[PDB]
Amino acid sequence: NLKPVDAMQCFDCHTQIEDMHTVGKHATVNCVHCHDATEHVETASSRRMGERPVTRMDLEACATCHTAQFNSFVEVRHESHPRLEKATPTSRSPMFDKLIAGHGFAFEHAEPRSHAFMLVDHFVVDRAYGGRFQFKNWQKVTDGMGAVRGAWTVLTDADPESSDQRRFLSQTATAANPVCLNCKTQDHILDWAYMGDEHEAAKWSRTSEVVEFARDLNHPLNCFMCHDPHSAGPRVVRDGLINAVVDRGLGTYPHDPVKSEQQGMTKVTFQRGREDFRAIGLLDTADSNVMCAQCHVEYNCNPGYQLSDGSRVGMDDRRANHFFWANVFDYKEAAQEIDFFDFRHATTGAALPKLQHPEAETFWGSVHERNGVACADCHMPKVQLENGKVYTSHSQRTPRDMMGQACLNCHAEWTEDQALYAIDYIKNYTHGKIVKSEYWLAKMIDLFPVAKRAGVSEDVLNQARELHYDAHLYWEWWTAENSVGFHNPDQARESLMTSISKSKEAVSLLNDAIDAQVAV
Amino acid sequence: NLKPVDAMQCFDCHTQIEDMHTVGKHATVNCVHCHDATEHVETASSRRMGERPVTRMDLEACATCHTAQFNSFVE
Amino acid sequence: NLKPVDAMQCFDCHTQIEDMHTVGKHATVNCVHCHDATEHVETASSRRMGERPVTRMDLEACATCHTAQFNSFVEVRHESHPRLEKATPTSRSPMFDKLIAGHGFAFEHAEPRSHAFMLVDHFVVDRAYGGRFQFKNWQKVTDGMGAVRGAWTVLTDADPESSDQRRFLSQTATAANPVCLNCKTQDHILDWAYMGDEHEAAKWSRTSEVVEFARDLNHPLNCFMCHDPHSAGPRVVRDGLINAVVDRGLGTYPHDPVKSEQQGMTKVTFQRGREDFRAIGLLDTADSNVMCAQCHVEYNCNPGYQLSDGSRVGMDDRRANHFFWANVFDYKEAAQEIDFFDFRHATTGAALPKLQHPEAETFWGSVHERNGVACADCHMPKVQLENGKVYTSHSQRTPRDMMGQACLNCHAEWTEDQALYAIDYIKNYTHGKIVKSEYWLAKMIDLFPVAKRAGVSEDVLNQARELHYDAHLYWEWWTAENSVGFHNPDQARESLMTSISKSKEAVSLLNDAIDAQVAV
Amino acid sequence: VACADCHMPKVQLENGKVYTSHSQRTPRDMMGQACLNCHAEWTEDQALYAIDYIKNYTHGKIVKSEYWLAKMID
Ligand code: HEC
Ligand code: HEC
Ligand code: HEC
Ligand code: HEC
Ligand code: HEC
Ligand code: HEC
Ligand code: HEC
Ligand code: HEC
Ligand code: HEC
Ligand code: HEC
Ligand code: HEC
Ligand code: HEC
Ligand code: HEC
Ligand code: HEC
Ligand SMILES: O=N[O-]
Ligand SMILES: O=N[O-]
Ligand SMILES: O=N[O-]
Ligand SMILES: O=N[O-]
Ligand SMILES: [Ca+2]
Ligand SMILES: [Ca+2]
Ligand SMILES: [Ca+2]
Ligand SMILES: [Ca+2]
């Protein structure tokens, strides 16, 4: 049974923690629930750690007093199809392989499933670790609670004796790197310096061997990613988000200075040896838009290349951990701002960006966002009870499963079927434009080998490659973004029409150049 | 927000509660969750209650940390 | 009303039948239930047949004493979509036409439906008989009981006056031949010599006019295909299976000599004029893996060509009736063993194999097979009754329709939704690799015309054709096999990755050769 | 067996931390957890049928007990 420790004795050294803990809703929650610090207390000084105290990162540290939120969080939505490859005619991007050729995502890119699995899914996807990690057997794929208890309780490593990234099966890639983990877990929150910079007090950084890092990590989406464990107040912990909002002064709502002021973020920094080490961002309000934007954004978390001279940008560069914090129409400028692109297309040779799930940046400026609606209103609403203490659902999922709480409470004029029909109208229309965008991208891509072999000039191929960048960006934003346009249908429509326009321009350029070569 | 009280000071006069509280699974659950004893502490001796402290009997005193049991109960 | 005949009088000549009938669970079942032999008894000698007795092949011969098994067998699963072409974006092989071009399956290849329809579906598919046979009208497609009563009660022949295979509609093929029928019916069991060899006592053989043969056949999947009608004991009757297991000594479980001994097969031969004529294989146990492997295997049942010299292998050759009895990683060697391939790809000119529904060979070595699980456990389990005599379901169908009996009885740790989710995880992942395999095969195939027209050498095109064989095999196994990887997910994954690897190798070979030609 | 086994059993979750139901009610609302876990030989309808056989028989004897009490009282 837990025995409380004397918190005043801790606070003698830990004034920041004292200021947070004594004022918030965890003022009565003793340190022993999450820390074992006995030897630490015996050996620390005011400025030196002494023996390192143990800190619990497991979600069950919160489940004892908040069982309802924990149980809701770990639920598995079986209707969210698992391991469903997006590059197929019946999923999000029928022509993904041709369009993304040259990028690691061609090796596998499945649709998202329930949050319980995020860390295990990261470890087992074919593009990440060369097939090194697998579930212990194919039955463990169902075990959300198990994954939450710890990735290594349900996974196996094909070679515990080596720590290099390599292929264990032929059609895999080794794209994982330590930055990825920041959107899967924060078990390393005390072992990672802000941004993953090299730091004397950090065991792990952007330049770590990712297989060794992986082995030290266990829990998905820790409860404390949105909730400070000391104050119980709302926060974010993701360095890339704090860097965009605070360091770069862009604000929580870059398009709305007023809302940014009302719903802002305060950066709090913790030191090691009186040098800045790690940071969190306390939120003015419990604003799920910013909490969910710790992960549901477009980012760099990988090496790449410079647009200016084509040279390599490695994990050691700060650009390998970057939140663009830009909507689709500002993205190209944001990538120019850091002089960066992701890969060269295998067929066209164009410098291209790789876009990832930009839900937060898409939602900006939408009718719902402009009316003060936030991700949680549609995806983790309050539970409605005939008799009971209300709490907030923590099962983040499509609103189709709770339409009464997620839509119909605001849209009293609609039945559930009418609301679903409205969502499907947008998704059907947006998906048709994604498919047409891919058709035109594919037609362009197919012309590159023909043009090269017909002797079309480098100057013309380069003009086409410049068109490819835009045609790609204005399409791939939408296959990466998970709402199939629902989060911002006018923007999706404008962007996809721009993609098509750019592809058509490139097709015309290439056809005319091929025809001129043939005619000579 | 609740502010914890010095449970050790209570135990100087409440050995019977001490022997139950320190040993069980509520050893870390501060008295402030269920008692308002400020004036009691100001006025009591080990042999004189002084001001009567308040004791919460409401089920919500438990529902804060045990919402699932409470919600299932009130259905 | 049936009057019993004196079986002792039969047994005077038929000692093999006596030995089987008197010992098994049909010892009380009189010959008159299945044979009308009066004139036969009057005219036969110990070695000459005399007048030929009538033998009932219809399933209703068993339905009078086994109504529950019959009724379960003839049920139509309406959820198993009928006449659903596999070569479409929403079915098993979106790029099948490009990949299989040159083969008769390009004319039509639908998904399987309920067993009641196997013989009628064989007769009406566009690739089989030139469109000669059709249902009497489009309504008869629902009539499972009717098909069981007899194919000719629900079908019409466009020209009863001719017996040649020819096209009656432009986009059909005439791929059917007498070997096919052995996996649709055994009405011909007394009229077909072992392997379909020419034989004095056989009306039909591999070299028969298949339209005339077709007209003599009526019933699907006769009950006696798995059950000896004399002993009632478990057996197989399919010659190609007996030949692989017994004649070729490969065993019922080629990878497991022990299990092969415990669950073996005894070949019993019947003679005509004291010459071997036909054979059955009595099973040591009621082993559905081997019963279902009478049909759910990869086979030859068609003419083809020799790998060594390209020469024609016709229906007259024993290789036209062949069970490879090899898993996907042993198949190429099994085809080399008989010096055989199926067709030349219409675009690449590569010699290619044609793979068919290899469920039995895929299941070998899987976790379930290694634990003693068999096809019937998942696809035709015991019926569970609150009060009743238990019998075995004979409706062979997906376990999704009876998850309590087909999965959850062994997997007590799972709910139905969890079990379904586990199946779908494997199928989704496997299907994504099928789609990626087709993408890479298609990319290679598309390069052949470009390479030929650019003047790439025959030597390079031949190297690519050799890669095509493997790229094809390691893909097509999985579109042919009906479990979308569930029967052996690790093997499917390894094979599909091999397919992709081979295609990629061929693409690189061809691109480099085209580029070199252009550069000259 | 104790009252809680039939009237406030542990909750069964595909994924989650087990806790004890505190909704003290008839087992008819949670037959999987309140009966069928120990009575593997039964379906839900069989277990309900066994309950009802007892209650029907008992209620008949209650009614007959009242009939005779009332006859005496009159
Ligand atoms: C002064 C003598 C201290 C007392 C008493 C306690 N801690 Fe401490 N702690 C101290 C230092 C100088 C450091 C390094 C960071 C800094 O602020 O300079 C720490 C570190 C921690 C940590 C972080 C551990 C990690 O893995 O990075 C935790 C969780 C921690 N301390 C907790 C803690 C608790 C619960 C205490 C009372 C039981 C406590 N500390 C006493 C200095 C001192
Ligand atoms: C019991 C010993 C607790 C443990 C362990 C944790 N929390 Fe807690 N939490 C606790 C209480 C008594 C309260 C106040 C209840 C009230 O409504 O007065 C809380 C409150 C929260 C809140 C709400 C904060 C707010 O609204 O300002 C959050 C978000 C919260 N707690 C989260 C949380 C997390 C993430 C934990 C694990 C790291 C956790 N709590 C542990 C009691 C206990
Ligand atoms: C990084 C730690 C994340 C934070 C914070 C949030 N989400 Fe998330 N989400 C994340 C990942 C890595 C995944 C995929 C998990 C996998 O194993 O595939 C997801 C998934 C979702 C989904 C899909 C769920 C489903 O049923 O398929 C939704 C609807 C979702 N995420 C929404 C969401 C919301 C609303 C958040 C703020 C409350 C949120 N997520 C935070 C990574 C992270
Ligand atoms: C936060 C900015 C993220 C970083 C850095 C990484 N990922 Fe991620 N991932 C993120 C979210 C919000 C989601 C769910 C939404 C979606 O569109 O998928 C995911 C999902 C995954 C998945 C499951 C889906 C799939 O693509 O198969 C995997 C396997 C995954 N992520 C792997 C991954 C790797 C290898 C990363 C570093 C290169 C990486 N992620 C970074 C959010 C974030
Ligand atoms: C961000 C992606 C979150 C993670 C991870 C966790 N929770 Fe949460 N929590 C979140 C939001 C947006 C809210 C609602 C805030 C509002 O006022 O609208 C909550 C709320 C809580 C509470 C308060 C009581 C309630 O409303 O339910 C508690 C006690 C709480 N959350 C606990 C909790 C635990 C235990 C988590 C890990 C399982 C957890 N939260 C994760 C956002 C986020
Ligand atoms: C209601 C007004 C919404 C707000 C605010 C947000 N999202 Fe959303 N989201 C919404 C719908 C109607 C859909 C389509 C769901 C469907 O079933 O068709 C989505 C989709 C998602 C997804 C994918 C969900 C899935 O299909 O499994 C994710 C990952 C998602 N949305 C995330 C998300 C985030 C992070 C938001 C705040 C920035 C957000 N959504 C706002 C409805 C609404
Ligand atoms: C948060 C500050 C709490 C309040 C207020 C109450 N309880 Fe509690 N309880 C709490 C914790 C952290 C634990 C230990 C959890 C663990 O498993 O380690 C408990 C435990 C219980 C138990 C189980 C005791 C046992 O198994 O021996 C019960 C029955 C329980 N608590 C009941 C309870 C009641 C009735 C309360 C109101 C008077 C109450 N608790 C308040 C945290 C908190
Ligand atoms: C009634 C006159 C029968 C006809 C016609 C057929 N069968 Fe039969 N069968 C019959 C009896 C009385 C029994 C024994 C019942 C018992 O359990 O003792 C059987 C048994 C079978 C079995 C089980 C064999 C075994 O387990 O060893 C099978 C597989 C079987 N019968 C099949 C069968 C078939 C395929 C028939 C048509 C060719 C058929 N039977 C006719 C009674 C009668
Ligand atoms: C040759 C005589 C066969 C034997 C012996 C078995 N099966 Fe079969 N199966 C066969 C054919 C020709 C077809 C397609 C029928 C058509 O008209 O399309 C099938 C079909 C199945 C199916 C699909 C049923 C559906 O609902 O779609 C299953 C699940 C199936 N077969 C399984 C099966 C099992 C388990 C067997 C051993 C008990 C078995 N079959 C024997 C041909 C033959
Ligand atoms: C046993 C070794 C078989 C031989 C010889 C033939 N077929 Fe077949 N067929 C077989 C099975 C087990 C199944 C169901 C499983 C599946 O993958 O389809 C089938 C199915 C058919 C069907 C329906 C499905 C379709 O392809 O449209 C048809 C029309 C069919 N089979 C025709 C056919 C022809 C023309 C054959 C000789 C060339 C032939 N089959 C042989 C098992 C066996
Ligand atoms: C192989 C593809 C089969 C065909 C065709 C038929 N049946 Fe069958 N039967 C089969 C199996 C695998 C079993 C179970 C054997 C075991 O012990 O597990 C059965 C069983 C019977 C029985 C026995 C009683 C029972 O278990 O139901 C009877 C009487 C029987 N089968 C009859 C039967 C009839 C009448 C058929 C044509 C409609 C028939 N079987 C086809 C496998 C096969
Ligand atoms: C359970 C452990 C199984 C055993 C043993 C066998 N099969 Fe199977 N099969 C299984 C599943 C879960 C599936 C996918 C079904 C779904 O609905 O997703 C299949 C599929 C088939 C099919 C196609 C069925 C359909 O979708 O209509 C066939 C023709 C099939 N399996 C045949 C088969 C044979 C002949 C087996 C023994 C060699 C066999 N299966 C074993 C589960 C299991
Ligand atoms: C399972 C073996 C039981 C145990 C142990 C206890 N009870 Fe029960 N109870 C049981 C049944 C099947 C029924 C009839 C319910 C029905 O729907 O027909 C009952 C009934 C009650 C009731 C009335 C409940 C109602 O119908 O709403 C009460 C108040 C009740 N039982 C209380 C109770 C107590 C206090 C027990 C322990 C001493 C107890 N029951 C044990 C099944 C079981
Ligand atoms: C007697 C009629 C009870 C009342 C009133 C309350 N609870 Fe209870 N509780 C009861 C039993 C029989 C059990 C299970 C004991 C066992 O181990 O079998 C419980 C359990 C708890 C627990 C432990 C965690 C769990 O098993 O759920 C907690 C935290 C708990 N109970 C809390 C609780 C609260 C908050 C109550 C008022 C709403 C409450 N209990 C009433 C019996 C009784
Ligand atoms: O790839 N090295 O972590
Ligand atoms: O790949 N995760 O964005
Ligand atoms: O094609 N002749 O049967
Ligand atoms: O075409 N039947 O395998
Ligand atoms: Ca999903
Ligand atoms: Ca990116
Ligand atoms: Ca089917
Ligand atoms: Ca074949």
Side-chain angles (χ1 to χ4, degrees), chain C residues 386-387 415 417-418, chain D residues 14-15 43 45-46:
Chain C
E386 284 161 306
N387 291 278
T415 60
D417 282 350
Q418 290 179 305
Chain D
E14 283 159 309
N15 293 280
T43 62
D45 280 352
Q46 293 179 304

Side-chain angles (χ1 to χ4, degrees), chain A residues 353-366:
Chain A
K354 177 72 189 78
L355 287 307
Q356 284 105 337
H357 42 64
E359 282 87 43
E361 306 96 318
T362 298
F363 185 55
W364 291 337
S366 67

Side-chain angles (χ1 to χ4, degrees), chain A residues 163-165 174 176-178 207-211:
Chain A
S163 64
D164 52 299
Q165 279 274 61
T174 47
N177 62 66
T207 61
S208 300
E209 290 193 282
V210 70
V211 170

